[PDB]
Protein backbone atom coordinates (compact mmCIF):
# COMPACT_ATOMS: atom_id res chain seq x y z
CA UNK A 1 0.00 0.00 0.00
CA UNK A 2 3.00 2.34 -0.31
CA UNK A 3 2.01 3.25 -3.89
CA UNK A 4 -1.48 4.20 -2.70
CA UNK A 5 -0.38 7.37 -0.87
CA UNK A 6 1.17 9.32 -3.74
CA UNK A 7 0.22 9.97 -7.36
CA UNK A 8 -1.52 13.29 -6.59
CA UNK A 9 -3.75 14.07 -3.58
CA UNK A 10 -6.99 12.11 -3.36
CA UNK A 11 -9.99 14.41 -3.72
CA UNK A 12 -12.05 12.07 -1.50
CA UNK A 13 -9.96 9.79 0.72
CA UNK A 14 -12.61 9.40 3.44
CA UNK A 15 -13.85 5.81 3.57
CA UNK A 16 -17.22 4.25 4.45
CA UNK A 17 -15.87 1.19 6.23
CA UNK A 18 -12.47 -0.21 7.18
CA UNK A 19 -9.72 2.40 7.41
CA UNK A 20 -7.28 2.48 4.45
CA UNK A 21 -4.30 2.48 6.83
CA UNK A 22 -5.61 -0.65 8.60
CA UNK A 23 -5.64 -2.72 5.39
CA UNK A 24 -2.01 -3.68 6.04
CA UNK A 25 -3.03 -5.44 9.27
CA UNK A 26 -5.79 -7.58 7.72
CA UNK A 27 -5.53 -9.96 4.77
CA UNK A 28 -8.33 -9.91 2.20
CA UNK A 29 -9.69 -12.51 -0.19
CA UNK A 30 -10.15 -10.59 -3.46
CA UNK A 31 -10.08 -6.94 -4.52
CA UNK A 32 -12.08 -5.30 -7.32
CA UNK A 33 -10.69 -2.16 -8.95
CA UNK A 34 -12.59 -0.21 -11.61
CA UNK A 35 -11.01 2.36 -13.92
CA UNK A 36 -13.06 5.22 -15.36
CA UNK A 37 -13.07 9.02 -15.44
CA UNK A 38 -15.86 11.28 -14.18
CA UNK A 39 -16.40 15.04 -14.17
CA UNK A 40 -15.52 17.26 -11.22
CA UNK A 41 -19.18 17.87 -10.40
CA UNK A 42 -19.93 14.12 -10.46
CA UNK A 43 -17.58 13.36 -7.55
CA UNK A 44 -20.18 14.18 -4.88
CA UNK A 45 -23.07 12.27 -6.50
CA UNK A 46 -21.68 8.84 -5.54
CA UNK A 47 -22.30 7.88 -1.90
CA UNK A 48 -23.75 4.97 0.12
CA UNK A 49 -27.51 5.47 0.21
CA UNK A 50 -27.35 8.50 -2.10
CA UNK A 51 -27.38 9.01 -5.86
CA UNK A 52 -27.59 11.78 -8.43
CA UNK A 53 -28.94 12.08 -11.97
CA UNK A 54 -25.77 10.74 -13.60
CA UNK A 55 -25.10 8.22 -10.82
CA UNK A 56 -28.56 6.61 -10.95
CA UNK A 57 -28.15 5.82 -14.66
CA UNK A 58 -24.55 4.66 -14.15
CA UNK A 59 -22.54 2.54 -11.69
CA UNK A 60 -23.88 2.97 -8.16
CA UNK A 61 -22.34 2.14 -4.79
CA UNK A 62 -24.98 0.80 -2.35
CA UNK A 63 -25.04 0.98 1.44
CA UNK A 64 -23.40 -2.45 1.85
CA UNK A 65 -20.29 -2.45 -0.35
CA UNK A 66 -17.28 -3.50 1.83
CA UNK A 67 -15.07 -0.75 0.50
CA UNK A 68 -15.08 2.87 -0.60
CA UNK A 69 -13.91 5.23 -3.36
CA UNK A 70 -10.54 6.99 -3.68
CA UNK A 71 -10.44 9.65 -6.40
CA UNK A 72 -7.83 12.25 -7.30
CA UNK A 73 -7.21 15.05 -9.80
CA UNK A 74 -4.64 14.53 -12.56
CA UNK A 75 -4.48 16.11 -16.03
CA UNK A 76 -1.91 14.44 -18.28
CA UNK A 77 -3.98 12.56 -20.87
CA UNK A 78 -7.42 13.07 -19.25
CA UNK A 79 -8.23 16.64 -20.33
CA UNK A 80 -8.37 17.83 -23.94
CA UNK A 81 -8.36 21.46 -25.06
CA UNK A 82 -10.23 20.46 -28.23
CA UNK A 83 -12.69 17.57 -28.21
CA UNK A 84 -13.06 14.57 -25.90
CA UNK A 85 -15.73 12.27 -27.33
CA UNK A 86 -14.28 8.92 -26.22
CA UNK A 87 -15.43 9.18 -22.60
CA UNK A 88 -19.23 9.09 -22.35
CA UNK A 89 -21.94 8.76 -19.72
CA UNK A 90 -25.53 7.55 -19.42
CA UNK A 91 -28.33 10.04 -18.81
CA UNK A 92 -31.37 8.25 -20.37
CA UNK A 93 -31.43 4.63 -19.19
CA UNK A 94 -34.27 2.08 -19.29
CA UNK A 95 -34.32 1.68 -15.49
CA UNK A 96 -32.18 2.19 -12.40
CA UNK A 97 -28.76 0.58 -12.83
CA UNK A 98 -28.35 -2.00 -10.08
CA UNK A 99 -24.90 -2.31 -8.46
CA UNK A 100 -22.36 -4.83 -9.80
CA UNK A 101 -23.97 -4.56 -13.24
CA UNK A 102 -22.92 -2.99 -16.53
CA UNK A 103 -24.48 -2.43 -19.94
CA UNK A 104 -23.36 -1.09 -23.33
CA UNK A 105 -25.62 0.40 -26.00
CA UNK A 106 -24.73 2.48 -29.06
CA UNK A 107 -28.34 2.43 -30.32
CA UNK A 108 -30.81 5.27 -29.79
CA UNK A 109 -33.15 5.32 -26.79
CA UNK A 110 -36.74 6.43 -27.32
CA UNK A 111 -38.63 8.82 -25.04
CA UNK A 112 -42.22 8.12 -26.10
CA UNK A 113 -44.59 5.46 -27.43
CA UNK A 114 -43.19 5.38 -30.98
CA UNK A 115 -40.56 2.60 -31.22
CA UNK A 116 -37.37 4.28 -32.44
CA UNK A 117 -35.53 1.21 -33.75
CA UNK A 118 -33.67 2.64 -36.73
CA UNK A 119 -35.24 6.08 -37.20
CA UNK A 120 -35.32 9.18 -35.00
CA UNK A 121 -36.42 12.81 -35.04
CA UNK A 122 -37.76 15.43 -32.64
CA UNK A 123 -39.20 12.98 -30.09
CA UNK A 124 -36.24 10.55 -30.00
CA UNK A 125 -32.76 11.33 -28.67
CA UNK A 126 -29.51 9.50 -27.95
CA UNK A 127 -28.93 8.07 -24.44
CA UNK A 128 -25.21 8.99 -24.29
CA UNK A 129 -23.31 12.28 -24.16
CA UNK A 130 -19.67 13.34 -24.01
CA UNK A 131 -17.92 15.14 -21.17
CA UNK A 132 -16.62 18.68 -21.39
CA UNK A 133 -13.11 17.68 -20.27
CA UNK A 134 -11.51 21.02 -21.15
CA UNK A 135 -8.84 22.96 -19.23
CA UNK A 136 -10.54 26.27 -20.09
CA UNK A 137 -13.65 25.28 -18.11
CA UNK A 138 -14.25 25.41 -14.36
CA UNK A 139 -13.22 23.16 -11.50
CA UNK A 140 -16.42 21.08 -11.65
CA UNK A 141 -15.88 20.38 -15.36
CA UNK A 142 -12.35 19.04 -14.81
CA UNK A 143 -11.83 15.28 -15.28
CA UNK A 144 -11.04 13.15 -12.23
CA UNK A 145 -9.39 9.72 -12.18
CA UNK A 146 -11.71 7.53 -10.10
CA UNK A 147 -11.09 4.04 -8.71
CA UNK A 148 -13.37 2.20 -6.27
CA UNK A 149 -12.00 -0.52 -3.99
CA UNK A 150 -14.44 -3.42 -3.56
CA UNK A 151 -13.82 -6.33 -1.20
CA UNK A 152 -15.51 -9.73 -0.91
CA UNK A 153 -15.17 -11.59 2.39
CA UNK A 154 -15.82 -15.12 3.69
CA UNK A 155 -15.94 -16.73 0.24
CA UNK A 156 -12.41 -17.99 -0.54
CA UNK A 157 -9.05 -18.63 1.16
CA UNK A 158 -7.19 -15.39 1.77
CA UNK A 159 -4.27 -14.66 -0.55
CA UNK A 160 -4.22 -10.85 -1.07
CA UNK A 161 -2.47 -9.93 2.17
CA UNK A 162 -0.95 -6.65 3.28
CA UNK A 163 2.78 -5.92 3.54
CA UNK A 164 4.72 -7.32 6.50
CA UNK A 165 7.88 -5.54 7.63
CA UNK A 166 11.20 -7.19 8.47
CA UNK A 167 13.93 -6.59 11.04
CA UNK A 168 17.66 -7.23 11.40
CA UNK A 169 19.52 -10.33 12.59
CA UNK A 170 20.32 -10.95 16.26
CA UNK A 171 22.80 -13.42 17.75
CA UNK A 172 23.40 -14.85 21.24
CA UNK A 173 20.85 -12.65 23.03
CA UNK A 174 17.36 -13.89 23.81
CA UNK A 175 14.59 -11.81 22.24
CA UNK A 176 10.82 -11.85 21.69
CA UNK A 177 10.96 -13.12 18.13
CA UNK A 178 8.21 -13.88 15.60
CA UNK A 179 8.85 -16.08 12.55
CA UNK A 180 5.93 -16.41 10.09
CA UNK A 181 3.38 -16.31 12.90
CA UNK A 182 5.35 -18.57 15.27
CA UNK A 183 5.91 -16.69 18.52
CA UNK A 184 8.40 -17.48 21.26
CA UNK A 185 11.26 -16.24 23.40
CA UNK A 186 14.84 -17.47 23.29
CA UNK A 187 18.33 -17.03 21.92
CA UNK A 188 19.20 -17.25 18.22
CA UNK A 189 22.26 -19.42 17.56
CA UNK A 190 23.90 -21.05 14.56
CA UNK A 191 22.51 -24.55 13.99
CA UNK A 192 24.33 -27.73 12.99
CA UNK A 193 21.08 -29.47 11.98
CA UNK A 194 20.03 -30.30 8.42
CA UNK A 195 16.50 -29.87 7.10
CA UNK A 196 14.67 -30.77 3.89
CA UNK A 197 13.57 -27.95 1.52
CA UNK A 198 9.89 -28.28 2.51
Amino acid at each position, epitope marked *: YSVLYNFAPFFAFKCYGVSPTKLNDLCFTNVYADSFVIRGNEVSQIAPGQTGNIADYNYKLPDDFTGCVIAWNSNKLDS*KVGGNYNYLYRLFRKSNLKPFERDIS*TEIYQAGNKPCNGVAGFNCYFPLRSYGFRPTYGVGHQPYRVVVLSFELLHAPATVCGPKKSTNLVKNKCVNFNFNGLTGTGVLTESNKKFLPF
Partner: antibody
Amino acid sequence: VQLVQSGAEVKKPGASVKVSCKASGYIFSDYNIHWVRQAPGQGLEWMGWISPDSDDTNYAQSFQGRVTMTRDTSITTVYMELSSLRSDDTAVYFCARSVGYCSLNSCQRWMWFDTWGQGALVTVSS
Amino acid sequence: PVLTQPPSASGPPGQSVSISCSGSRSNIGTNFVYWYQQLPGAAPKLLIYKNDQRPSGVPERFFGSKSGTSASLAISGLRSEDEVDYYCAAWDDSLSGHVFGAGTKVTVL
Protein backbone atom coordinates in the same frame (compact mmCIF):
# COMPACT_ATOMS: atom_id res chain seq x y z
CA VAL B 1 -2.26 26.77 -38.81
CA GLN B 2 0.24 25.36 -41.32
CA LEU B 3 -1.80 22.68 -43.11
CA VAL B 4 0.32 22.78 -46.29
CA GLN B 5 1.04 19.69 -48.40
CA SER B 6 4.05 17.85 -49.79
CA GLY B 7 4.37 17.55 -53.55
CA ALA B 8 4.14 14.15 -55.21
CA GLU B 9 4.76 12.86 -58.73
CA VAL B 10 2.85 10.54 -61.05
CA LYS B 11 3.87 6.89 -60.76
CA LYS B 12 3.02 3.75 -62.70
CA PRO B 13 1.07 1.00 -60.89
CA GLY B 14 3.23 -1.46 -58.99
CA ALA B 15 5.10 1.02 -56.76
CA SER B 16 4.48 3.23 -53.73
CA VAL B 17 4.52 7.00 -53.26
CA LYS B 18 5.10 9.27 -50.26
CA VAL B 19 2.31 11.71 -49.36
CA SER B 20 2.73 14.10 -46.43
CA CYS B 21 0.41 16.68 -44.87
CA LYS B 22 1.85 19.29 -42.52
CA ALA B 23 0.49 19.01 -38.97
CA SER B 24 2.37 21.96 -37.45
CA GLY B 25 0.87 25.15 -36.02
CA TYR B 26 -1.13 23.33 -33.34
CA ILE B 27 -0.58 20.82 -30.55
CA PHE B 28 -0.45 17.26 -31.86
CA SER B 29 -1.97 15.38 -28.91
CA ASP B 30 -5.54 16.76 -29.00
CA TYR B 31 -6.56 17.38 -32.65
CA ASN B 32 -7.27 14.46 -34.97
CA ILE B 33 -6.25 14.50 -38.64
CA HIS B 34 -8.59 12.91 -41.18
CA TRP B 35 -8.04 12.03 -44.84
CA VAL B 36 -10.98 12.00 -47.27
CA ARG B 37 -10.55 11.19 -50.96
CA GLN B 38 -12.63 12.86 -53.69
CA ALA B 39 -12.73 10.61 -56.76
CA PRO B 40 -14.55 11.62 -59.96
CA GLY B 41 -17.23 9.27 -61.23
CA GLN B 42 -18.02 7.98 -57.73
CA GLY B 43 -18.67 9.12 -54.19
CA LEU B 44 -16.10 10.02 -51.57
CA GLU B 45 -14.58 7.33 -49.36
CA TRP B 46 -13.24 7.42 -45.80
CA MET B 47 -11.11 4.52 -44.61
CA GLY B 48 -9.97 5.19 -41.04
CA TRP B 49 -8.58 7.57 -38.45
CA ILE B 50 -5.50 7.65 -36.21
CA SER B 51 -4.75 8.59 -32.62
CA PRO B 52 -1.79 11.00 -32.81
CA ASP B 53 -0.13 9.93 -29.56
CA SER B 54 0.29 6.13 -29.91
CA ASP B 55 -0.68 3.19 -32.14
CA ASP B 56 -4.48 3.15 -32.40
CA THR B 57 -6.58 2.92 -35.55
CA ASN B 58 -9.61 1.23 -37.08
CA TYR B 59 -10.01 0.24 -40.73
CA ALA B 60 -13.33 0.40 -42.56
CA GLN B 61 -14.47 -2.43 -44.85
CA SER B 62 -13.20 -0.81 -48.06
CA PHE B 63 -9.40 -0.63 -47.69
CA GLN B 64 -7.38 -3.33 -45.94
CA GLY B 65 -3.73 -3.06 -47.00
CA ARG B 66 -3.56 -0.34 -49.64
CA VAL B 67 -3.19 2.62 -47.24
CA THR B 68 -0.85 2.70 -44.24
CA MET B 69 -1.00 5.62 -41.79
CA THR B 70 1.92 6.57 -39.53
CA ARG B 71 2.70 9.44 -37.17
CA ASP B 72 5.75 11.29 -35.86
CA THR B 73 5.65 13.52 -32.78
CA SER B 74 9.30 14.64 -32.70
CA ILE B 75 8.98 16.97 -35.71
CA THR B 76 5.14 16.85 -35.96
CA THR B 77 4.85 15.48 -39.49
CA VAL B 78 2.74 12.58 -40.76
CA TYR B 79 3.64 10.31 -43.69
CA MET B 80 1.23 8.13 -45.67
CA GLU B 81 1.86 5.45 -48.29
CA LEU B 82 -0.30 4.80 -51.35
CA SER B 83 0.42 1.52 -53.14
CA SER B 84 -1.00 -0.05 -56.32
CA LEU B 85 -2.52 3.09 -57.82
CA ARG B 86 -5.48 2.34 -60.07
CA SER B 87 -8.83 3.82 -61.13
CA ASP B 88 -10.11 3.54 -57.54
CA ASP B 89 -7.07 5.44 -56.22
CA THR B 90 -7.60 8.35 -58.65
CA ALA B 91 -8.59 11.00 -56.10
CA VAL B 92 -7.37 14.04 -54.19
CA TYR B 93 -6.43 12.92 -50.67
CA PHE B 94 -7.56 15.98 -48.74
CA CYS B 95 -6.22 16.79 -45.28
CA ALA B 96 -8.90 17.40 -42.63
CA ARG B 97 -8.10 18.75 -39.16
CA SER B 98 -10.69 18.21 -36.41
CA VAL B 99 -11.06 18.27 -32.63
CA GLY B 100 -11.40 15.07 -30.65
CA TYR B 101 -9.27 12.20 -29.38
CA CYS B 102 -11.16 9.27 -30.97
CA SER B 103 -9.60 6.09 -29.65
CA LEU B 104 -13.05 4.40 -29.82
CA ASN B 105 -15.89 3.89 -32.30
CA SER B 106 -18.65 6.04 -30.76
CA CYS B 107 -16.63 9.28 -30.83
CA GLN B 108 -17.23 9.88 -34.55
CA ARG B 109 -20.96 10.61 -34.12
CA TRP B 110 -20.41 13.79 -32.07
CA MET B 111 -17.38 14.94 -34.09
CA TRP B 112 -17.44 17.32 -37.06
CA PHE B 113 -14.72 18.12 -39.59
CA ASP B 114 -13.32 21.49 -38.51
CA THR B 115 -10.80 22.64 -41.13
CA TRP B 116 -9.64 21.33 -44.51
CA GLY B 117 -6.30 22.57 -45.78
CA GLN B 118 -4.14 22.00 -48.88
CA GLY B 119 -5.14 18.57 -50.14
CA ALA B 120 -2.35 16.79 -51.99
CA LEU B 121 -3.20 15.91 -55.60
CA VAL B 122 -2.32 12.41 -56.82
CA THR B 123 -2.55 11.31 -60.44
CA VAL B 124 -2.84 7.61 -61.21
CA SER B 125 -1.38 6.62 -64.58
CA SER B 126 1.07 4.10 -66.00
CA PRO C 1 -25.65 1.19 -46.62
CA VAL C 2 -24.46 3.33 -49.53
CA LEU C 3 -25.93 6.82 -49.34
CA THR C 4 -28.42 7.67 -52.09
CA GLN C 5 -27.91 11.26 -53.26
CA PRO C 6 -29.20 12.70 -56.55
CA PRO C 7 -26.54 13.82 -59.05
CA SER C 8 -28.30 17.00 -60.23
CA ALA C 9 -30.70 19.28 -58.36
CA SER C 10 -33.31 21.35 -60.20
CA GLY C 11 -33.64 24.29 -57.83
CA PRO C 12 -35.47 27.34 -59.14
CA PRO C 13 -34.42 30.63 -57.53
CA GLY C 14 -36.85 32.66 -55.45
CA GLN C 15 -38.75 29.68 -54.00
CA SER C 16 -37.86 27.12 -51.36
CA VAL C 17 -37.17 23.48 -52.23
CA SER C 18 -36.07 20.47 -50.18
CA ILE C 19 -33.82 17.65 -51.39
CA SER C 20 -33.60 14.17 -49.87
CA CYS C 21 -30.52 12.09 -49.06
CA SER C 22 -31.75 8.68 -47.90
CA GLY C 23 -29.58 5.82 -46.69
CA SER C 24 -30.66 2.44 -45.33
CA ARG C 25 -31.66 0.73 -42.09
CA SER C 26 -29.26 1.30 -39.15
CA ASN C 27 -27.42 3.97 -41.17
CA ILE C 28 -29.54 7.12 -40.73
CA GLY C 29 -31.24 7.54 -37.36
CA THR C 30 -28.73 5.62 -35.27
CA ASN C 31 -26.19 8.34 -36.12
CA PHE C 32 -26.61 11.94 -37.20
CA VAL C 33 -26.43 13.20 -40.78
CA TYR C 34 -23.89 15.93 -41.55
CA TRP C 35 -23.96 18.58 -44.28
CA TYR C 36 -20.75 19.89 -45.84
CA GLN C 37 -19.63 21.73 -48.96
CA GLN C 38 -16.60 22.23 -51.18
CA LEU C 39 -15.78 24.67 -53.96
CA PRO C 40 -14.29 23.31 -57.21
CA GLY C 41 -10.58 24.00 -56.91
CA ALA C 42 -10.70 24.90 -53.21
CA ALA C 43 -10.63 23.25 -49.81
CA PRO C 44 -13.92 22.00 -48.30
CA LYS C 45 -15.69 23.81 -45.48
CA LEU C 46 -18.42 23.04 -42.94
CA LEU C 47 -22.08 23.86 -43.66
CA ILE C 48 -24.32 22.23 -41.00
CA TYR C 49 -23.46 19.94 -38.08
CA LYS C 50 -25.90 17.87 -35.95
CA ASN C 51 -28.88 19.42 -37.86
CA ASP C 52 -29.58 21.55 -34.77
CA GLN C 53 -27.52 24.77 -34.79
CA ARG C 54 -26.08 26.88 -37.61
CA PRO C 55 -22.32 27.47 -37.24
CA SER C 56 -20.64 30.85 -37.35
CA GLY C 57 -19.16 32.09 -40.61
CA VAL C 58 -21.99 30.60 -42.69
CA PRO C 59 -25.14 32.62 -43.54
CA GLU C 60 -28.39 31.28 -42.08
CA ARG C 61 -29.95 30.11 -45.34
CA PHE C 62 -29.55 26.32 -45.29
CA PHE C 63 -31.74 24.58 -42.71
CA GLY C 64 -30.45 21.46 -40.97
CA SER C 65 -33.22 18.92 -40.50
CA LYS C 66 -33.84 15.18 -40.46
CA SER C 67 -37.22 13.40 -40.51
CA GLY C 68 -37.20 9.60 -40.52
CA THR C 69 -34.98 7.65 -42.91
CA SER C 70 -34.94 10.48 -45.46
CA ALA C 71 -32.70 13.44 -44.62
CA SER C 72 -34.21 16.74 -45.78
CA LEU C 73 -32.09 19.81 -46.54
CA ALA C 74 -34.24 22.95 -46.54
CA ILE C 75 -33.20 26.26 -48.11
CA SER C 76 -34.67 29.77 -48.07
CA GLY C 77 -33.84 31.80 -51.17
CA LEU C 78 -31.24 31.12 -53.86
CA ARG C 79 -28.21 33.22 -54.81
CA SER C 80 -25.68 32.96 -57.62
CA GLU C 81 -22.85 33.26 -55.07
CA ASP C 82 -24.09 30.16 -53.18
CA GLU C 83 -23.87 27.53 -55.93
CA VAL C 84 -21.32 25.46 -54.00
CA ASP C 85 -21.17 21.67 -54.26
CA TYR C 86 -23.12 20.32 -51.28
CA TYR C 87 -22.50 16.82 -49.96
CA CYS C 88 -24.17 14.22 -47.76
CA ALA C 89 -22.12 12.76 -44.91
CA ALA C 90 -23.14 10.14 -42.35
CA TRP C 91 -21.57 7.74 -39.87
CA ASP C 92 -22.33 4.01 -40.02
CA ASP C 93 -21.83 1.60 -37.13
CA SER C 94 -21.92 -1.37 -39.54
CA LEU C 95 -19.05 0.06 -41.62
CA SER C 96 -16.88 2.04 -39.13
CA GLY C 97 -16.45 4.80 -41.69
CA HIS C 98 -18.00 7.89 -43.21
CA VAL C 99 -20.41 7.05 -46.04
CA PHE C 100 -20.76 9.45 -48.98
CA GLY C 101 -23.31 9.52 -51.78
CA ALA C 102 -22.96 10.63 -55.38
CA GLY C 103 -23.24 14.36 -54.60
CA THR C 104 -25.66 17.08 -55.76
CA LYS C 105 -24.89 19.58 -58.52
CA VAL C 106 -27.11 22.67 -58.42
CA THR C 107 -27.73 24.58 -61.66
CA VAL C 108 -29.75 27.79 -61.87
CA LEU C 109 -32.85 27.30 -64.01
